[PDB]
Tab-separated table of C-alpha atoms in Angstrom:
chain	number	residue	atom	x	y	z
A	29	UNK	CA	7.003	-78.507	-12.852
A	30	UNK	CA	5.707	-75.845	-10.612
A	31	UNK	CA	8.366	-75.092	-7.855
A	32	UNK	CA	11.274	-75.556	-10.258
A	33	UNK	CA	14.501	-73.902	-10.513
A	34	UNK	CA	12.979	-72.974	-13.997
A	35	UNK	CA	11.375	-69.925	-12.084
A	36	UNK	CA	14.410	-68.285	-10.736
A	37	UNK	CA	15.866	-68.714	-14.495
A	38	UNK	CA	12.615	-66.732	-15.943
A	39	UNK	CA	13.051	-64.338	-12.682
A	40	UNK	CA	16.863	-63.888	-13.705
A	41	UNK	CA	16.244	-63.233	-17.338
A	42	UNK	CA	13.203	-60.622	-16.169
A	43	UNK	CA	15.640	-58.971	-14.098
A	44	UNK	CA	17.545	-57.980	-16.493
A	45	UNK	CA	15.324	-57.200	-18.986
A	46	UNK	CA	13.454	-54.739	-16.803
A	47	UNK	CA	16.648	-52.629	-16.772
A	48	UNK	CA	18.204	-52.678	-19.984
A	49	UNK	CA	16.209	-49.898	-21.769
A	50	UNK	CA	16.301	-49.713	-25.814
A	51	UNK	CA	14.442	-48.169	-28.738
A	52	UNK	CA	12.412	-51.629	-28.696
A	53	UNK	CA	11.100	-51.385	-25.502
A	54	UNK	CA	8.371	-48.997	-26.316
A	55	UNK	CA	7.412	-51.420	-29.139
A	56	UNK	CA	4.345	-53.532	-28.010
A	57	UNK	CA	2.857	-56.950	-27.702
A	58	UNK	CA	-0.504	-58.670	-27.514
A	59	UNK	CA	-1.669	-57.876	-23.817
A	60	UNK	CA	-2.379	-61.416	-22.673
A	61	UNK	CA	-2.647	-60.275	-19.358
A	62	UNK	CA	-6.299	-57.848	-20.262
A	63	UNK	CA	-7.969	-61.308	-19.804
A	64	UNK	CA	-10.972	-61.579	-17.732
A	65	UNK	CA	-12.454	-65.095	-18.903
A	66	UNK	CA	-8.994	-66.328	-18.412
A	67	UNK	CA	-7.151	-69.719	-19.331
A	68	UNK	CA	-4.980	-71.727	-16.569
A	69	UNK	CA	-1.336	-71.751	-15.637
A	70	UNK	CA	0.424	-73.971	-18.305
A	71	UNK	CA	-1.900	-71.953	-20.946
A	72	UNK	CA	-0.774	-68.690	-19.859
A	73	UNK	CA	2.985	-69.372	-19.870
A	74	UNK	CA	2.669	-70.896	-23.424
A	75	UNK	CA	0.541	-67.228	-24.238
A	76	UNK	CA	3.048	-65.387	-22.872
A	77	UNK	CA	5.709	-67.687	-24.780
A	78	UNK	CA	3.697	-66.969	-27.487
A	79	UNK	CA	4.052	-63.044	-27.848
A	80	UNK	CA	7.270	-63.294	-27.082
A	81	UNK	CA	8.257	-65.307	-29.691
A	82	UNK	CA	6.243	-63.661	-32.081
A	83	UNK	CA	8.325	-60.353	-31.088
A	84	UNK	CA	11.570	-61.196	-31.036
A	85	UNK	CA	10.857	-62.615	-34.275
A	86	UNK	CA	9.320	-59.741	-35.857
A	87	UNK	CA	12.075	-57.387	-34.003
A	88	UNK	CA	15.338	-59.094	-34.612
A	89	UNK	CA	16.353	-57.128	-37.963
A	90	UNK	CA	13.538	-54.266	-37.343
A	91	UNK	CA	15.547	-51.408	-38.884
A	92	UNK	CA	14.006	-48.856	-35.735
A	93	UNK	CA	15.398	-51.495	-33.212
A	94	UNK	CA	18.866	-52.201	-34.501
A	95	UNK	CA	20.682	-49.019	-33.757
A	96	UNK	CA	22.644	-46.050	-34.529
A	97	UNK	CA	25.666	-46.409	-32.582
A	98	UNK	CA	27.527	-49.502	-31.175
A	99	UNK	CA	26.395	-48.958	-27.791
A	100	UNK	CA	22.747	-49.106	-29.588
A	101	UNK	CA	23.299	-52.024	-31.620
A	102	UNK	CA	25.265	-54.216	-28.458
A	103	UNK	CA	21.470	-53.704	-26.677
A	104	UNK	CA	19.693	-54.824	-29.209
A	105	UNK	CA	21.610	-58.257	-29.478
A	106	UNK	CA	21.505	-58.700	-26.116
A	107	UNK	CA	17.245	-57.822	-25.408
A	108	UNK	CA	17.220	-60.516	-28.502
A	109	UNK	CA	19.002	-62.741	-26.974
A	110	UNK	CA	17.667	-62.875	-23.569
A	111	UNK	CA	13.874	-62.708	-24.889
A	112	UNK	CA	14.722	-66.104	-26.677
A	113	UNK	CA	16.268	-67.283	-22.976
A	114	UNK	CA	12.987	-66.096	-21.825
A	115	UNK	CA	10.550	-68.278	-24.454
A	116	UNK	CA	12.880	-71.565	-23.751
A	117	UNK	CA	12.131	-71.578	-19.996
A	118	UNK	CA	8.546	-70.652	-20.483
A	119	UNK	CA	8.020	-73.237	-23.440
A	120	UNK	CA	9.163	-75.916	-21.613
A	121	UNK	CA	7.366	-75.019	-18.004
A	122	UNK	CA	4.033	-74.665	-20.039
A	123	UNK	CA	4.504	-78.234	-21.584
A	124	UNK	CA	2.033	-76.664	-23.590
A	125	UNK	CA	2.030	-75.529	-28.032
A	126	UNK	CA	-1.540	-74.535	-28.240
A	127	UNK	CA	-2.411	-71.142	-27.536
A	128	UNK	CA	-5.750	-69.014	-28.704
A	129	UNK	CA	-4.373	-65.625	-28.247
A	130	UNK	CA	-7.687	-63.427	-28.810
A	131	UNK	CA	-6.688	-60.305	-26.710
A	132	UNK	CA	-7.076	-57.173	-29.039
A	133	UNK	CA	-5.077	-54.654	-26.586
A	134	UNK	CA	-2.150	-54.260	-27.023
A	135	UNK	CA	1.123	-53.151	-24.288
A	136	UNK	CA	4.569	-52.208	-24.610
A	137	UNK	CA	7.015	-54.769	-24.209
A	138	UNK	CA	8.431	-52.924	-21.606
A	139	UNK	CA	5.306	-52.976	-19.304
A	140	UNK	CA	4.678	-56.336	-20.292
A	141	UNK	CA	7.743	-57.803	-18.844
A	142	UNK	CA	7.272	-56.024	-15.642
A	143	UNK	CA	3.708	-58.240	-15.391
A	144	UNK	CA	5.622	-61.192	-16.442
A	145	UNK	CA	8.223	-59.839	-13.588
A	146	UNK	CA	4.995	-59.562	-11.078
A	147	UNK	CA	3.371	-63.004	-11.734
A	148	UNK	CA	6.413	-65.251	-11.397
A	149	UNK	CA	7.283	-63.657	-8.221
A	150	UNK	CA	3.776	-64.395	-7.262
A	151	UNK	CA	4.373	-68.099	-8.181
A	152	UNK	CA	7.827	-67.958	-6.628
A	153	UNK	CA	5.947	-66.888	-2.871
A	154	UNK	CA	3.671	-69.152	-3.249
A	155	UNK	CA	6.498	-72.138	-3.515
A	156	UNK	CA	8.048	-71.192	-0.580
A	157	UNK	CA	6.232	-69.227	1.645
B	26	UNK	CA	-24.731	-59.458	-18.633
B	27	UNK	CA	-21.439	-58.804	-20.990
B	28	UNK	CA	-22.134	-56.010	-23.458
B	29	UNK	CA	-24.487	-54.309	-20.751
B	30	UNK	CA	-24.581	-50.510	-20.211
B	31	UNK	CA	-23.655	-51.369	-16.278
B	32	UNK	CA	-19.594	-51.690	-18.390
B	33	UNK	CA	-20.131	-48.032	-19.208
B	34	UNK	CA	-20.824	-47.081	-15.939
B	35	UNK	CA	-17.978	-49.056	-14.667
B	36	UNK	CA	-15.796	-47.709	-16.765
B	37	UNK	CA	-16.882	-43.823	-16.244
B	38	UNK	CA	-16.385	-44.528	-12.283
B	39	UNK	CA	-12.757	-45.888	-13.103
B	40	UNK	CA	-12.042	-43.118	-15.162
B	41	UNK	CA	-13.452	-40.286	-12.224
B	42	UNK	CA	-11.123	-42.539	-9.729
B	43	UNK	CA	-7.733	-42.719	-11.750
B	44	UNK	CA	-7.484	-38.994	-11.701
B	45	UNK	CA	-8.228	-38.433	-8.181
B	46	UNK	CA	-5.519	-38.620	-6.190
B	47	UNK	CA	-6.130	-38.456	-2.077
B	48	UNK	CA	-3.375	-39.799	0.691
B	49	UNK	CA	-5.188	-43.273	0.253
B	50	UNK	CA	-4.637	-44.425	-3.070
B	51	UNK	CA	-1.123	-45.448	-1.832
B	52	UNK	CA	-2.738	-47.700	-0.082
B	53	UNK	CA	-2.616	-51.738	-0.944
B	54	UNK	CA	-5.172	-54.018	-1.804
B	55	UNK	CA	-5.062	-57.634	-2.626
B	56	UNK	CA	-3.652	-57.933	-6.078
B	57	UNK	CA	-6.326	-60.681	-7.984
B	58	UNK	CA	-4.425	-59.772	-10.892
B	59	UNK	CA	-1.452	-61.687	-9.819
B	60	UNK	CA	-2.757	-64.931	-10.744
B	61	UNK	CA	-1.318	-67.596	-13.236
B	62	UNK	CA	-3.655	-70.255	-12.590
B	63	UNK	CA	-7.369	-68.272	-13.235
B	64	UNK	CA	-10.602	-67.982	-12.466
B	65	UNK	CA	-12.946	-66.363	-14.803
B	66	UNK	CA	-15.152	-63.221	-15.590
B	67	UNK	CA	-17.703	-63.830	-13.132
B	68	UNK	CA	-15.131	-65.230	-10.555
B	69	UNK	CA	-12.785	-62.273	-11.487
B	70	UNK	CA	-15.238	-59.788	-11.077
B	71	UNK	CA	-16.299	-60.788	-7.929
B	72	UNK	CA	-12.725	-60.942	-6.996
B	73	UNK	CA	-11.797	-57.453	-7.822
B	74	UNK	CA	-15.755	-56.169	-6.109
B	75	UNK	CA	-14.114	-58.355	-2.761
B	76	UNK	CA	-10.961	-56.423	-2.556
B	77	UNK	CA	-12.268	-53.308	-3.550
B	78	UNK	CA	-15.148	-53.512	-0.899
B	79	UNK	CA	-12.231	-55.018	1.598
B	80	UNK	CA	-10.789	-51.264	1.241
B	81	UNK	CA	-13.287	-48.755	1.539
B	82	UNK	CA	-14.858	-50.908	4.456
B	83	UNK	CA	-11.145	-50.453	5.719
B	84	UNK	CA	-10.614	-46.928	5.175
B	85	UNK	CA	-13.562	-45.242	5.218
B	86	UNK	CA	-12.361	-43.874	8.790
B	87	UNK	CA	-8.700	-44.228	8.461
B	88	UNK	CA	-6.698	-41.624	10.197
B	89	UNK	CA	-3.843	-41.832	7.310
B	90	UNK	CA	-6.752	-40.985	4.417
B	91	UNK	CA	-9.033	-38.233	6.119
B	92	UNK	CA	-7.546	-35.544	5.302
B	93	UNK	CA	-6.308	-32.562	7.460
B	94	UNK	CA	-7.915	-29.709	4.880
B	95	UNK	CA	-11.266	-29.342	3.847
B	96	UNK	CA	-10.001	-29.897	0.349
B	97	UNK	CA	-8.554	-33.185	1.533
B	98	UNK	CA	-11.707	-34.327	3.184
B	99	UNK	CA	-14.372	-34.346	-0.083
B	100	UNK	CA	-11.478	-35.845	-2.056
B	101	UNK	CA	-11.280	-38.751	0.593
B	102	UNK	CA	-15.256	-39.041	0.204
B	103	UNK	CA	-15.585	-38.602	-3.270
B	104	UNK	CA	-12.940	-41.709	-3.045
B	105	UNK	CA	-15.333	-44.178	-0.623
B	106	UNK	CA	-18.473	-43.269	-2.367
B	107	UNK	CA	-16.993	-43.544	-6.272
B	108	UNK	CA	-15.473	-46.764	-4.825
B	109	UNK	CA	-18.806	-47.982	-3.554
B	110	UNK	CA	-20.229	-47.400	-6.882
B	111	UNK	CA	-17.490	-49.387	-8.662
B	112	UNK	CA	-18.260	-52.407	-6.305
B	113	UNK	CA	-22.418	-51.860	-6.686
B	114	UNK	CA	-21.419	-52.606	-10.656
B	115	UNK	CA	-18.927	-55.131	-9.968
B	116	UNK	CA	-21.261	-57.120	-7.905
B	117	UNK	CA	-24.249	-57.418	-9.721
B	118	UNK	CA	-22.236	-57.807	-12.935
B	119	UNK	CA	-20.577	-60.827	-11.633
B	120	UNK	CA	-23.700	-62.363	-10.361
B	121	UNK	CA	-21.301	-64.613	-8.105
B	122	UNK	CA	-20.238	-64.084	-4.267
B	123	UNK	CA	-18.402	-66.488	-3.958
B	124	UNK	CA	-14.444	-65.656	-3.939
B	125	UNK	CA	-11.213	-67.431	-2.564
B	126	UNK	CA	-8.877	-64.310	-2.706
B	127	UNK	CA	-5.902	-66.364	-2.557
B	128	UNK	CA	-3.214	-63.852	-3.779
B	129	UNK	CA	-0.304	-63.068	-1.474
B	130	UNK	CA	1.356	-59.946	-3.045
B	131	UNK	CA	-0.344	-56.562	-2.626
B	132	UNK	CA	-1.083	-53.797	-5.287
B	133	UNK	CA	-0.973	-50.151	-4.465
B	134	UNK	CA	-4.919	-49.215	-5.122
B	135	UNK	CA	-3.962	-46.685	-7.455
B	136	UNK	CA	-2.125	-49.388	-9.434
B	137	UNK	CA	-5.125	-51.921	-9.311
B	138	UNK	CA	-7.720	-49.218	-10.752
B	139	UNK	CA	-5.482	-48.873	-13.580
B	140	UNK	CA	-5.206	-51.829	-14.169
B	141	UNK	CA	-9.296	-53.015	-13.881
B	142	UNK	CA	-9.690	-49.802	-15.798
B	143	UNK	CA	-7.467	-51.955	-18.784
B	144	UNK	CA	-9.467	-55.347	-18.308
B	145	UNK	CA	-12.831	-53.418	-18.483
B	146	UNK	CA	-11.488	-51.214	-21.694
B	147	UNK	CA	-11.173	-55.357	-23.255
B	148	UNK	CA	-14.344	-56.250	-22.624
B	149	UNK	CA	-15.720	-53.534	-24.430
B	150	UNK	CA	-13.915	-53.628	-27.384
B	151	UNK	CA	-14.944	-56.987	-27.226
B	152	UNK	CA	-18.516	-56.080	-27.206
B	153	UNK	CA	-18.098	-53.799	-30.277
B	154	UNK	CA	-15.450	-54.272	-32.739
């Protein structure tokens, strides 16, 4: 499903995302998007579902992530949170489980999402357009 | 040719051009790095030597990017020529011309060097490590 309502869900959640700002964001992921060979639509979402995951997962109790204050900690929860929202819609519009992630490069989270951000508006455009 | 010297000199004219800064590298080109789907290193390269050659060709004369000074002026040639050089690379390192540029959303050129700059920094860490 290309033109699905899926896409304004991952374009919510990346809204969002791009503006809530904690000690995480500065953390970084493998830079699936420093590709030149590339892969194809359904394999990058399940690439990009792929880092996530691993992220999240490696970040949920990560002792400089969780926070000082309340304020701190209330972030965290919620940049968890919507990073899983983020990996359900993209495992599910990839269809795809198989994913060869040989980038070496790595980006902050933080600039990552924004590509995420720039590529599903792309895909958005081109559904309507 | 992937671990050829030709990435070197790609990579030295990228680094020249992402410190310049002249009234034109404001200016949008087609972003090919807004693509889900994909190509691949020859098509990509090709690609990025298509809108990069699109630009120069387009504001080599532009009244916005000459300059008023005289300090203006050389930067705004030192921009077409360094930019000529990047596509002479890109070119012959693709080996293609061939290229269906069919991205809609634009990329400040400033934005796009940065970001071959990263895809070309891949390749040769690639070729080494």
């Amino acid at each position: 499903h290309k033109c699905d309502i899926t896409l304004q869900e991952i374009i919510k959640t990346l809204n969002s995302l791009t503006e809530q700002k904690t000690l995480c964001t500065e953390l970084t992921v493998t830079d699936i998007f420093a590709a030149s060979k590339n892969t194809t639509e359904k394999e990058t979402f399940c690439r990009a579902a792929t880092v996530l995951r691993q992220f999240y997962s490696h970040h949920e109790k990560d002792t400089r992530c969780l926070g000082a204050t309340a304020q701190q900690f209330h972030r965290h929860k919620q940049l968890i949170r919507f990073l899983k929202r983020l990996d359900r819609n993209l495992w599910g519009l990839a269809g795809l489980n198989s994913c060869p992630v040989k980038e070496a490069n790595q980006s902050t989270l933080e600039n990552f999402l924004e590509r995420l951000k720039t590529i599903m508006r792309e895909k958005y455009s081109k559904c309507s357009s």
